[PDB]
């Protein structure tokens, strides 16, 4: 049975105006800016951007990849597909 989201979990994350996007739950580094309450820091593969999202916009990757894990013309998307499949836990700074 599922747990709450934790750092390192792999997802597709939904933002307004964007396709469901390959992403991970990030940690928050010591001394770094924390998210708002009930929000998680989401790192988006390919773009390497961070947004703060809640669970309603977070789709576990394993369950969802058949539906959402296909190429997209959008900038960074296909790089992001490679990242989440091949090195999802790397440093992308």
3-state secondary structure the chain: CCCCCCCCCEEEECCCCCCCEEEEECCCCCCCCCCCCCCEEEEECCCCEEEEECHHHEEEHHHHHHHHCCCCCCCCHHHHHHHHHHCCCCCCC
Number of domains making up the chain? 1
**What Cα–Cα distance (Å) separates residue 91 from each residue in 18, 19, 45, 60, 77?**
24, 24, 11, 21, 18
Residue 2 lies in a domain: no
What is the CATH classification number for the domain harbouring 39? 2.30.30.140
Residue 28 lies in a domain: yes
CA distance 68 to 34: 29
**Helix boundaries (H) for 23-93:** 61-68, 77-86
- Partners of residue 40 on adjacent β-strands: 53
Residue 4 lies in a domain: no
Residue 93 lies in a domain: no
CA distance 7 to 24: 8
SS3 (DSSP) at 71: coil
Q: Per this entry, what is the length of the chain?
A: 93
Domain extent at residue 45: 10-86
């Amino acid at each position: 049975m599922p747990h709450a989201f934790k750092p390192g979990d792999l997802v597709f994350a939904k933002m307004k105006g964007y396709p469901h996007w390959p992403a991970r739950i990030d940690d928050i580094a010591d001394g770094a800016v924390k998210p708002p309450p009930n929000k998680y820091p989401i790192f988006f593969f390919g773009t390497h951007e961070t947004a703060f999202l809640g669970p309603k916009d977070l789709f576990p990757y394993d369950k969802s990849k058949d539906k959402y894990g296909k190429p997209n013309k959008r900038k960074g998307f296909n790089e992001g597909l490679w990242e989440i499949q091949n090195n999802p836990h790397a440093s992308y700074s």
